[PDB]
Structures are given as structure tokens and as C-alpha cells.
């Protein structure tokens, strides 16, 4: 019935690496140290 | 001449430091009231 496409994405924090897109959530980077975290947290329980 | 004890590894001490740290993460929602909303409010309106 639509004149346009009645689907329409919203993203987190858009835009062009330069010539394609990217998009993140807030948990793009913050992955790293939370892995990072848990690998210190680990290798203690060996100890115990 | 005296008999030195074990003082509890070190190691298993900083593993109940990041034991104690592990569970009071999720335990906080985003609340900062004592009632209904207030930063729950993911919890509270998917109910309603």
C-alpha cells in the first residue's frame, strides 16, 4: 500500500569508515578490555 | 625457633578481590531510587 519503504533502520553512532559505512553500539572497543579483564581473573584460579 | 603459618596465598587473595568484584556488576541496574524506575526502567516497562 506504501509510496516509500516502511522499513527504516536506526543505528547507535553511524557513519563512513571513508567509502562504505560503520556502525557500533556503545560495546565496540569495550570487548577488549573485558576479555582482557577476565584472562587476569583466570589465570589466578590455576594458582588457587 | 617458631613455625610460620600460612598467611593465605596471595594469589588466592587477588582472586576474592576480583570474586567479590565479579558479582556486584550486574547487581546494579541502573537504579538510584527505592521504587519503580529511576534508571530500571527497561525491567519496569517491559511488565506494563
Known amino acids: ?5 516502511p ?9 563512513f569508515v571513508e567509502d562504505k559505512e560503520v556502525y ?3 560495546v565496540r572497543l569495550t ?7 577476565n584472562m587476569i581473573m583466570s589465570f ?3 594458582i588457587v | 625457633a617458631y613455625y610460620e603459618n600460612p598467611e593465605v596465598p596471595q594469589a588466592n587473595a ?3 578481590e576480583a570474586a567479590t568484584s565479579a558479582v556486584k556488576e550486574v547487581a546494579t ?3 538510584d531510587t527505592e521504587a519503580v524506575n529511576g534508571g530500571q526502567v527497561a525491567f519496569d516497562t517491559v511488565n506494563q
Open chain 1, 1 to 5: 500500500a506504501g509510496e516509500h519503504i
Open chain 1, 7 to 15: 522499513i527504516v533502520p536506526v543505528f547507535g553512532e553511524w557513519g
Open chain 1, 24 to 26: 557500533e553500539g556503545v
Open chain 1, 31 to 37: 570487548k577488549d578490555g573485558q576479555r582482557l579483564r
Open chain 1, 44 to 46: 589466578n584460579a590455576d
Open chain 2, 14 to 16: 587477588y582472586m576474592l
Open chain 2, 29 to 31: 541496574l541502573g537504579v
